[PDB]
Every structure is written in C-alpha cells, then in structure tokens.
Amino acid sequence: WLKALFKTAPTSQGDISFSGGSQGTSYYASIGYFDQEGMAREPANFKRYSGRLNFESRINEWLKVGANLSGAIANRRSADYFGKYYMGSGTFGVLTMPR
C-alpha cells in the first residue's frame, strides 16, 4: 500500500542569465524553468516559467533611475486530501489499508 499511494517523482530545473553592464548602467537578466512533481501519487506539482530583468543607470550627477522587472507563468496543484482521514488515501491509507 505504500507503492499504491506514493511514487518516486522528478524535479527538473534550468536557467540562463546574462549579467554585465558598464558605465553608470547595469543589467541582470535571466530566463528559467522549474518543475517539481509531488511524490504523493495523489497529484500535486509546482512548475514555473521565469523571467527577470534588473536595470540601473546613472543619467547625470543628480539622477539615477532603475527598474527590476519579474514575471512568470506558473502551474500549481496540491494534494487536498492530506491531513484528513479518508479510507484509502495518504500515509494514513498506506498504514491502515488491510493488506
């Protein structure tokens, strides 16, 4: 019953990021990927597709402007039966189901 309700699951992430700049101006940009699948067989996951751009620039001896911009497309799902006692689910299931 452990194998019935729990699995080995994968986590995958990758990322590239261009940093530099030179003068009074500076840039830090990155795109990235993340996907963590939940080991409970009751489905649950958190995957995100990421981007960020940070920017700062001295314009003159009085002014300095800057932005940091970030966003993402994200998919989350959660095992909503956990922490309750339902016959054949969760770690309670894996202990209480007659073999």
Binding site: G83, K84, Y85, Y86, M87, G88, T96
Partner: peptide, 10 residues
C-alpha cells in the same frame, strides 16, 4: 468514506 474516530484538530 472518512473515519472520524477522533480528529484532534490542529
């Protein structure tokens, strides 16, 4: 099918 038995709540 839930087993209330006793749910000492959190």
């Amino acid at each position: 099918a839930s087993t209330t038995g006793a749910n000492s709540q959190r």
